[PDB]
């Protein structure tokens, strides 16, 4: 059915998104290794810079606040990975 074809396409997109989140995680781990800091590595200026750039590029069907929510979770995960 058409609905099953669309769900398959979304399923494959999920795995494409996962692969990029993982590649991004490896980059953020390397950033941790490079950056020699205080109690924690949180940098709100960096966060805001990334967020602004993502929103600048948001032509898609989601609201900017929704996109921000999702990327904040991605970032939070990156920081936690570094702090491992
Ligand atoms: O932006 C953040 C943290 C964002 C965050 C959002 C919600 C939270 O509840 C939280 O604990 C951290 O950190 C910068 C980006 C980074 O998380 C990334 O590129 O994945 C690396 C981190 O070292 C930066 O400070």
Numbering used by the authors: 4 to 39, 41 to 88
How do the authors describe this structure?
The first step of the pathway, aldol condensation of phosphoenolpyruvate (PEP) and D-erythrose-4-phosphate (E4P) to 3-deoxy-D-arabino-heptulosonate-7-phosphate (DAHP) is catalyzed by the DAHP synthase enzyme. In B. subtilis, regulation of DAHP synthase is thought to be controlled by its N-terminal domain (BsCM_2), which has residual chorismate mutase activity. Herein, we have reported the crystal structures of the BsCM_2 domain of DAHP synthase from B. subtilis in complex with citrate and chlorogenic acid. A functional trimer has three active sites formed at the interface of two monomers. However, BsCM_2 forms an entirely helical dimeric structure with two active site clefts which are formed by the residue contributions from both monomers, as previously described.
BsCM_2 crystals complexed with citrate (BsCM_2-CIT) and substrate analogue chlorogenic acid (BsCM_2-CGA) diffracted up to 1.9 Å and 1.8 Å resolution, respectively. BsCM_2-CIT and BsCM_2-CGA structures contain four and two monomers per asymmetric unit, respectively. In BsCM_2–CGA, the monomeric structure contains a ‘Chorismate Mutase, type II fold’, a three-helix bundle connected through the loops. Chlorogenic acid, a structural analogue of the enzyme’s substrate, was co-crystallized with the BsCM_2 protein. Unambiguous electron density of this ligand was observed at both the active sites of the dimer. At active site S1, the chlorogenic acid makes hydrogen bonds with the side chain of Arg27, Lys38, Gln86, and the main chain atoms of Arg45, Asp47, and Phe79 of chain B. The ligand molecule also interacts with Lys38, Arg50, and Lys80 of chain B, and Arg10 of chain A through water bridge formation. In BsCM_2-CGA, chlorogenic acid interacts with active site loop L1 residues Arg45 and Asp47 directly and via water bridges mediated by hydrogen bonds. This extensive hydrogen-bonding network might be stabilizing loop L1. Overall, the structure of BsCM_2-CGA resembles the closed conformation observed in prephenate bound GspDAH7PS structure.
